[PDB]
A paper describes a structure:
In S. aureus, the enzymes CapE, CapF and CapG catalyze the sequential transformation of UDP-D-GlcNAc in the CP precursor UDP-L-FucNAc via the intermediate compound UDP-N-acetyl-L-talosamine (UDP-L-TalNAc). CapF is a metalloenzyme containing a Zn2+ ion in the cupin domain crucial for catalyzing the first chemical reaction, and also important for the stability of the enzyme.
To avoid this severe complication, we employed the truncated construct CapFΔ57-70 and successfully obtained the structure of the enzyme-inhibitor complex. The molecule of 3-isopropenyl-tropolone is bound deep inside the active site of the cupin domain of CapF near the Zn2+ ion. The carbonyl and hydroxyl groups of the tropolone ring are found within the coordination sphere of Zn2+ at distances of 2.2 Å and 1.9 Å, respectively. Superposition of the coordinates of bound and unbound CapF revealed a shift in the position of Zn2+ by approximately 1.4 Å towards the tropolone ligand, resulting in the disruption of the coordination bond between Zn2+ and the residue His290. Taken together, the interaction between 3-isopropenyl-tropolone and CapF seems specific because of the combination of strong coordination bonds to the metal and the high shape complementarity with residues of the binding pocket of the cupin domain.
Residue numbers in the entry:
A (entry chain B): 1 to 57, 71 to 95, 106 to 369
B (entry chain A): 1 to 57, 71 to 95, 111 to 369
The structure:
Amino acid sequence: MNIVITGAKGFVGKNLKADLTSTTDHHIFEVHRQTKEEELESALLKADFIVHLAGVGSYLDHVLDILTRNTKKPAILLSSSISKLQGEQLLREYAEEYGNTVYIYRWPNLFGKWCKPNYNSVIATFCYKIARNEEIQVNDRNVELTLNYVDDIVAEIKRAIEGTPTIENGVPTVPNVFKVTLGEIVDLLYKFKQSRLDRTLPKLDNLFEKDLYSTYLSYLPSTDFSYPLLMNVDDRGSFTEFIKTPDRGQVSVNISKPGITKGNHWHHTKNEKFLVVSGKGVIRFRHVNDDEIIEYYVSGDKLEVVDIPVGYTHNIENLGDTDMVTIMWVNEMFDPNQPDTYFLEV
Amino acid sequence: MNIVITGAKGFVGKNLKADLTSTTDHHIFEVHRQTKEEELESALLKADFIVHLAGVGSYLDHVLDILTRNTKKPAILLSSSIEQLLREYAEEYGNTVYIYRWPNLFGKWCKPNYNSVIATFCYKIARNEEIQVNDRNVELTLNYVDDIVAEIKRAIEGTPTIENGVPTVPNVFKVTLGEIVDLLYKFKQSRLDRTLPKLDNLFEKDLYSTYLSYLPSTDFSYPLLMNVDDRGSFTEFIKTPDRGQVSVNISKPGITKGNHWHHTKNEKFLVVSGKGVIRFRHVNDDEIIEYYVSGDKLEVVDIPVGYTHNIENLGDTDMVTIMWVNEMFDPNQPDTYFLEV
Ligand SMILES: C=C(C)c1ccccc(=O)c1O
Ligand SMILES: C=C(C)c1ccccc(=O)c1O
Ligand SMILES: [Zn+2]
Ligand SMILES: [Zn+2]
């Protein structure tokens, strides 16, 4: 199928173009302000489907006029919004005079990667500014925004292309509409930034937050994709926290130099998992009231997880000639009021 | 203080004993069935606080009778469940008596195939043994041993938890057998699917730690699946529906991996052993951005959407990278496109 995308260099166009050329065999005719009038016409008259992303307005009228001479009666997709609605009745009359299926959508504000900041998306501007430690302006935190993520826009458009749009009360409607306050948005973005300092992760079964997180990351300066962890270092090795959550535990990285033993503690309720990913050694266990010592000989050649059960004192020792690197998951963030850690030599 | 724990070899006793000797300077007098009558009496008459764990009955009456001759009028703590007489004792001899009404209890060090159905389920389930559930809808009322211990320590210091004028251990749980069993089978099945329990659910958190204490000594570890080839390996470690997934990538010397991008999926790389480079290119651009990283200096590299990226080992040894991804792999939305940086 020959698919024309007008406004193809825009936020949505670029997203759609990349997707269609990645996931279909359709011939994409990009139209934009560098297109010559000849190639606009040529493309329109060959078209099977027209995805119109530029405004309603004189440009569209011109595109529509050319399409009256396209003998295949290609379907046309556009959005009438800008919160005002323009041109709708005229476009229904066009569809009915010339036959073309015309899908009029009423897209709300949009967000996602590749949207130009300091232009006409407030979320692009907040992401851009916040990632660059630039001051933002929030007149009122309680303003509600109605939003669609670009992936859903793209997917709804693809569904229309293959003849199965999403209809609601007799109107094409992209799903996964989000209704959120500015204050909730801004708070999430500042949270994403602060997480490089506190190691926390977003809540990724919240669809809006998930979408916004990926969006925010696309605005990072090229020089800013990495960030330092805090390596607590001494002549025994190091210990470095990587990620913390309130509900799925915390992962850290322990490193022990040759000949080094660490640990010799137990808890009542706190528990861990060790996974040795480089080097070799031994994890030892003893029941607080017993003398039986249980040893697990482990190494990065064979990845196995060792649960650290409660009520056992345990230590970990490097038995090789290189650094021994262990990933260490713990069931809960450290709480100064309930450290739940007791020193006892295995 | 001199603190007597009757029934000290029991489930609660052993828990309490280990805690008190770990977090206080108090002199603990364990009494139990190996205590001689002389040592019972001696200990009781010296006592400042009596934590009675053997429950009500002729044994307790005998303990109470001895304590009428303890000049210091020590406080006494017990649980009446399985009363008026004990209120009358307190009022005749002066001693502060805390009557609790503990429901069923669970936690580590409880003897299985005995008096605790949760101990039995943990024990059995960890050993791949058949369990009996007559009715899944039976509701159990429960306290975790840590809360029992803590409430007792609070009473020792003179500040118990009172409700409707009765000592009550908090964090009472009300749960069906079916919910308990389903969580335990889940904990086991997680060794196969890499998932983690929901640890801001207090009961599930407590139960998870409890379950782990029942693992056979030979069963503390479990294999991960190392997808291995001549380039290295890739091994999933942990998966969650809400905080992403962590895996371990290993590349041999000279090896490049990746050269893909996503729309919405994203990752974090953390090189913990060896050294190399993580590369990035915007899908519509030619600018290649490179991050030179190694295990000598732990830094996280976010993998942002809309950039194709690869990772290459530039050293002598295996290059070990921990890789967090924002979502479990979904066959209907793999959201991964091959593109050479
Ligand atoms: C709980 C931590 C941070 C830790 C760290 C290093 C080595 C052995 C341990 O058992 C351990 O618990
Ligand atoms: C998403 C995974 C599993 C992965 C694994 C190895 C190397 C490089 C990658 O970019 C990567 O995405
Ligand atoms: Zn530990
Ligand atoms: Zn990747």
